[PDB]
């Protein structure tokens, strides 16, 4: 059964990205999916995306710009403090120069650099680079 809609969204988006598609459809939508997409768009890895209200769960149509190499969730959502971020950076990321890890801290959903800025920890949602 659909146990993690975030994984389905990220996997469909990555599969469409590898095939050179310019748009991708994500169903069902959710607030955490929207926040993850907002972070990715703010850092400049995707472009426009619009939520469509189907009165049941909503869909998302996302516009790709070819800049996204990989994006994927981490399951189960392990708990990381501020001192463990570096370790996870050495595991999920290509290099220390770029890449991003998404954390769902109690201050919201953000990237790992912002979490270090605010000195807060939380669980790991996924990653993208």
């Amino acid at each position: 059964v659909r146990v993690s809609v975030l994984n389905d969204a990220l996997k469909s988006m990555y599969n469409a990205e590898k095939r050179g598609k310019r748009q991708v459809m994500i169903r069902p939508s959710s607030k955490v999916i929207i926040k993850f997409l907002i972070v990715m768009q703010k850092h400049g890895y995707i472009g426009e995306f619009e939520y469509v209200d189907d009165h049941r769960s909503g869909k998302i149509v996302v516009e790709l710009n070819g800049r996204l190499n990989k994006c994927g969730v981490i399951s189960p959502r392990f708990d990381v403090g501020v001192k463990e971020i570096e370790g996870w950076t050495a595991r999920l990321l290509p290099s220390r120069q770029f890449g991003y890890i998404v954390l769902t801290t109690s201050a919201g959903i953000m990237d790992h650099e912002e979490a270090r800025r605010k000195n807060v920890g939380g669980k790991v949602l996924g990653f993208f680079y």
Partner: protein, 220 residues
């Protein structure tokens, strides 16, 4: 001594090039080995192995020696040549020719800081050749090459100074091991870093902007 047989060699011979990065820029199919002789100033050649393979005939076993050669100055250029011949001399010479023909550029990045003379691969890069998978991961300035003898030789000739390597599969197979190492060294220039994604400008290919001297001035 040398009579060019292709447009690229005919273009090179009189001196219409300085380096070979413009040939890479248009992904031109280099097919004459004197082009890399003229363009790349320094080339070093060490043979890696001379493996005798056999084919069983009705009379006996026909043996042929297959030689592996690694080419490239330790400044970002490297190439790999494999040649199987009747005896070792022609195998080595042909493998040298093929290695010089197969020179590719490698991308060297930094670990955490931009103090000059980059010394490491920019990203985490992997290469698979049959079963042998090799991975290189960036390393700090003083690490050095952490690899077996074969990837160490390939990376030394490629110009890498420090890197962290892994391996999986039957690395005893020298052909697959060295081919995976070289293949992923090619992939080092393939990752799309956030710096590369500034919009691209286009430049006339050597076949297109040298049309004046390529219509019918055959060899004069």
């Amino acid at each position: 001594k040398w009579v060019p047989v292709t447009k690229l060699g005919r273009l090179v011979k009189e001196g219409r090039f300085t380096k070979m990065e413009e040939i890479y820029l248009h992904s031109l199919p280099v097919k004459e080995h004197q082009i890399v002789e003229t363009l790349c100033p320094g080339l070093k050649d060490e043979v890696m192995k001379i493996t005798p393979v056999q084919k069983q005939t009705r009379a006996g076993q026909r043996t042929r020696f297959k030689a592996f050669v690694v080419v490239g100055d330790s400044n970002g250029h490297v190439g790999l040549g494999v040649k199987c011949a009747k005896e070792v001399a022609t195998a080595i010479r042909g493998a040298i020719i093929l290695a010089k023909l197969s020179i590719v550029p490698v991308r060297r990045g930094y670990w955490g800081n931009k103090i000059g003379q980059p010394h490491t691969v920019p990203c985490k890069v992997t290469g698979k050749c049959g079963s042998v998978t090799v991975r290189m991961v960036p390393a700090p300035r003083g690490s050095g090459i952490v690899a077996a003898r074969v990837p160490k030789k390939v990376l030394q000739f490629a110009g890498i100074d420090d890197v962290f390597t892994s391996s999986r599969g039957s690395t005893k197979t020298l052909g697959n091991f060295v081919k995976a190492t070289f293949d992923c060294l090619m992939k080092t220039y393939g990752f799309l870093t956030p710096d590369f994604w500034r919009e691209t400008t286009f430049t006339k290919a050597p076949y297109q902007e040298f049309t004046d001297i390529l219509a019918k001035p055959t060899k004069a």
